[PDB]
């Protein structure tokens, strides 16, 4: 009878097994223990069956050391790195090839005529590049590129598919840009296969703008510079410097961006675009001869200075661009009358030369990263472990689940609270809430008559009306709060000096959802009304012990009121001579008035001890004249306020003296046959309420332990499952700086594997 | 029929548990009457009154 919710769950839980254990045992334990093992061993077979078919498309199985997915290893390493750390602290050490040049140059053309002319939005009229776009190029058949690493199935040779693919990239480009600028560092990941593509990662960084026009947000050019740090602070970056062939080199921006990155040109190759505009204006090949020699290019870029040319139409196909480029370069005086042989100028030579320089840098520098990340992990683990010796290995998934079980365990522990605590806490809390209402609004005005029948009649009518409207509504609220008060203590209270504060955000977050769903039984009040009516209706106290308990607790309530009034009075009247002379204090003129106003009222009560609480205006006038006769002029309102506090002090002392004789007078045996005027009807009123609330608490406790705590437990389970799925809150709640460090350690460990996997793939040559 | 077959078996356990809890308390408070009915109660009075 102490608790019934736990028994119900066990009974039906066994029933479920009795009917379905022959299916549950296989699914719940046998399958799950083998499930993890088969992931390593049997999924291996299905992965290999498809992988081999995919490798045949790659040709990796057919040809040793030659596989189109071999270059995809390089991108996988960077994809983890960008997710692990997209900031300069990690990005600055990641090898890459970047397209750098004046925005007007159309610098991206170096990549458009390879694969991107079909799927990347282009054309003049507006700035196209909005954020760094990385394209993973690989020798292979035509295949729809990955867009934001998302799979696609499109034909790259038909306009209808390509147009939709151009839309997809544009959406990422603009969405990466936030208010205040037109460019964003947030990168876009593309991976395309097709003929003529080289194994390398080329990034089209947003074009630099000398000045921010009114058509662009003010921070455009500063943002591009910060994005330009992808190479300016990256010793592993290869820079393709694009000179806008429409304008002279002395008008360029790229010269300063790269010359401050590598003034020796060791990390860069200079490329020129739109050279054919030289013949749409008065061509000056003598300036081109300086261009090839790098006289006017401070970065002294190394390699052959390739040139890109195009019809300028934004619909020219990749094949059309290649054919146009070859014919123009092989005949134009810009290159035929200067030392720029077309077979070195052609973009396809740049793609090969860029691919050649790409693998040179990657193999040389990649091994340094493996040592760097390993050193990082050891330094992080040493400090992380020393500050958190308890957690040698931690994850945010492990952190959440521990709380999930811990929370459910505590709420169950809350369900283990004995009724003794519930009944005492509910009874004590509820009575204290309504202890003054009865005294001030029911008892004291009823005490103004000497007719005990009216006294009991008056209160009973008020109580029944009060009972119907207030008592069960306050009682449930106390019970609802009382359960939450213990729940919070069970939930988030520390175990002395040991406490995992890392879990407090989730615990309180779970509570708020669980209390919102904690709807107390809407009919609990109806039972209490019947109970309270019966508890009040039965006023028969035939037991001395019932009398003894009721009177002592009534005294405490009255003594509390007496001190409450007395403390208010002392402030109203101030210190007496004992404290005025002891602490060198004095009275305010109001306190002086109150003391004399008190004295006159005390004298009035000294004789008229039975004076009713209500004062006649003649008494108010009499006091005023009695005080005015001593030089004290008092507003009637002061007297009435003084009167109320002093009267209760007078009354309450009388009531306690009545209580003293009620217990003592009846206690003496020979006095029980003396019918004195000591009808302790207040003890009858107090006793019934004490019993009435005690029964109320028991009804609340029964509902508390039978229905409400189970609803609280059920809601917690519903909320915790929502949190289990709510990754963002789990991240937002689990921010303890050790799980985040543990998360970083995991990512570092993964990168070390990914770094070595690619490095291991480099070592396939020997 | 999906809901009825799934949940109906729970009722059988619930009612059986109800009877055992009711019989335990009912029998303990009324050990004399292991089985009682309002028809048996009336007839006993009928004979008792006539006697
Ligand atoms: N004349 C000429 N036009 C080009 C060349 N490369 C690209 N374009 C034109 O520039 C426009 C878009 O090229 P794109 O590489 O996207 O430059 P961006 O949009 O300014 O970054 C298209 O209309 C192309 O025809 C080139 O080498 N010569
Ligand atoms: F014109 Al650009 F990136 F070269 F928008
Ligand atoms: K442009
Ligand atoms: Mg562009």
UniProtKB/Swiss-Prot annotation, chain B:
Subcellular location: Mitochondrion intermembrane space
Physiological role: Constitutes the soluble short form (S-OPA1) generated by cleavage by OMA1, which plays a central role in mitochondrial inner membrane fusion and cristae morphology. The transmembrane long form (L-OPA1) and the S-OPA1 form higher-order helical assemblies that coordinate the fusion of mitochondrial inner membranes. Inner membrane-anchored L-OPA1 molecules initiate membrane remodeling by recruiting soluble S-OPA1 to rapidly polymerize into a flexible cylindrical scaffold encaging the mitochondrial inner membrane.
Name of the molecule in the record: Dynamin-like GTPase OPA1, short form
Higher taxonomy: Eukaryota, Metazoa, Chordata, Craniata, Vertebrata
Gene that produces this protein: OPA1
């Amino acid at each position: 009878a102490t608790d019934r919710g736990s028994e119900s769950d066990k009974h039906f839980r066994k029933v479920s097994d009795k009917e379905k254990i022959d299916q549950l045992q296989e699914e719940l334990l046998h399958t799950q223990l083998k499930y993890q093992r088969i992931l390593e061993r049997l999924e291996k077979e299905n992965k290999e069956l498809r992988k081999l078919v995919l490798q045949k498309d790659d040709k990796g199985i057919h040809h040793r050391k030659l596989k189109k997915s071999l270059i995809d290893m390089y991108s996988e390493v960077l994809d983890v790195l960008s997710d692990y750390d997209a900031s300069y602290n990690t990005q600055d050490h990641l090898p890459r090839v970047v397209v750098v040049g004046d925005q007007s140059a159309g610098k991206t053309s170096v990549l458009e005529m390879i694969a991107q002319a079909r799927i990347f939005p282009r054309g003049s009229g507006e700035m196209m590049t909005r954020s760094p776009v990385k394209v993973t190029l690989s020798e292979g058949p035509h295949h729809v590129a990955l867009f934001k690493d998302s799979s696609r199935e499109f034909d790259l040779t038909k306009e209808e598919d390509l147009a939709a693919l151009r839309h997809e990239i544009e959406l990422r480009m603009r969405k990466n840009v936030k208010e205040g600028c037109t460019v964003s560092p947030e990168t876009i990941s593309l991976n395309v296969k097709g003929p003529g593509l080289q194994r390398m990662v080329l990034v089209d960084l947003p074009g630099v703008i000398n000045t921010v026009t009114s058509g662009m947000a003010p921070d455009t050019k500063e943002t591009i510079f910060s994005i330009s740090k992808a190479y300016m602070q990256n010793p592993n970056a290869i820079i393709l410097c694009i000179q806008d062939g429409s304008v002279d080199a002395e008008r360029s921006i790229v010269t300063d961006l790269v010359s401050q990155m590598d003034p020796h040109g060791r990390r860069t190759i200079f490329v020129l675009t739109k050279v054919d505009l030289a013949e749409k204006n008065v061509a000056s090949p003598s300036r081109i001869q300086q261009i090839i020699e790098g006289k006017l290019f401070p970065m002294k870029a190394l390699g052959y200075f390739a040139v890109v040319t195009g019809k300028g139409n934004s619909s020219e196909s990749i094949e059309a661009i290649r054919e146009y480029e070859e014919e123009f370069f092989q005949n134009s005086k810009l290159l035929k009358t200067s030392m720029l042989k077309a077979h070195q100028v052609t973009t396809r030579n740049l793609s090969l030369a860029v691919s050649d320089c790409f693998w040179k840098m990657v193999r040389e520098s990649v091994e340094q990263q493996a040592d760097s990340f390993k050193a990082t992990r050891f330094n992080l683990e040493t400090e992380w472990k020393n500050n958190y010796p308890r957690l040698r290995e931690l994850d945010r998934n492990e952190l959440f689940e521990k709380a999930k079980n811990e929370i459910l365990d505590e709420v169950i522990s809350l369900s283990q609270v004995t009724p003794k605590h519930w009944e005492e806490i509910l009874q004590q809390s509820l009575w204290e809430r309504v202890s003054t209402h009865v005294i001030e609004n029911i008892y004291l005005p009823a005490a103004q008559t000497m007719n005990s029948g009216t006294f009991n009649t008056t209160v009973d009518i008020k109580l029944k009306q009060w009972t119907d409207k207030q008592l069960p509504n306050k009682a449930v609220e106390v019970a609802w709060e009382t359960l939450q008060e213990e729940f919070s203590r069970f939930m988030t209270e520390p175990k002395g000096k040991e406490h995992d504060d890392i879990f407090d955000k989730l615990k309180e977050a779970v509570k708020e959802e669980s209390i919102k769903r904690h709807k107390w039984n809407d009919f609990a009040e109806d039972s209490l009304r019947v109970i309270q009516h019966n508890a009040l209706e039965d006023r028969s106290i035939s037991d001395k012990q019932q009398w003894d308990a009721a009177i002592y607790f009534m005294e405490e309530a009255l003594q509390a009121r007496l001190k409450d009034t007395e403390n208010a009075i002392e402030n109203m009247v101030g210190p007496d001579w004992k404290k005025r002379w002891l602490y060198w204090k004095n009275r305010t003129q109001e306190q002086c008035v109150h003391n004399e106003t008190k004295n006159e009222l005390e004298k009035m009560l000294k004789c008229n001890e039975e004076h009713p609480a209500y004062l006649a205006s003649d008494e108010i006038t009499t006091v005023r004249k009695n005080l005015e006769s001593r030089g004290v002029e008092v507003d009637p309102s002061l007297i009435k306020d003084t009167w109320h506090q002093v009267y209760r002090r007078h009354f309450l002392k009388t009531a306690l003296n009545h209580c003293n004789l009620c217990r003592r007078g009846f206690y003496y045996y020979q006095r029980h046959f003396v019918d004195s005027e000591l009808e302790c009807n207040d003890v009858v009123l107090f006793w019934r309420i004490q019993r009435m609330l005690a029964i109320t608490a028991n009804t609340l406790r029964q509902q508390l332990t039978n229905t409400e705590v189970r609803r609280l437990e059920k809601n917690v389970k519903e909320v915790l499952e929502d949190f289990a799925e709510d990754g963002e809150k789990k991240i937002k709640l689990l921010t303890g700086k050790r799980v985040q460090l543990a998360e970083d350690l995991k990512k570092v460990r993964e990168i070390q594997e990914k770094l070595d996997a690619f490095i291991e793939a480099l070592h396939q040559e020997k």
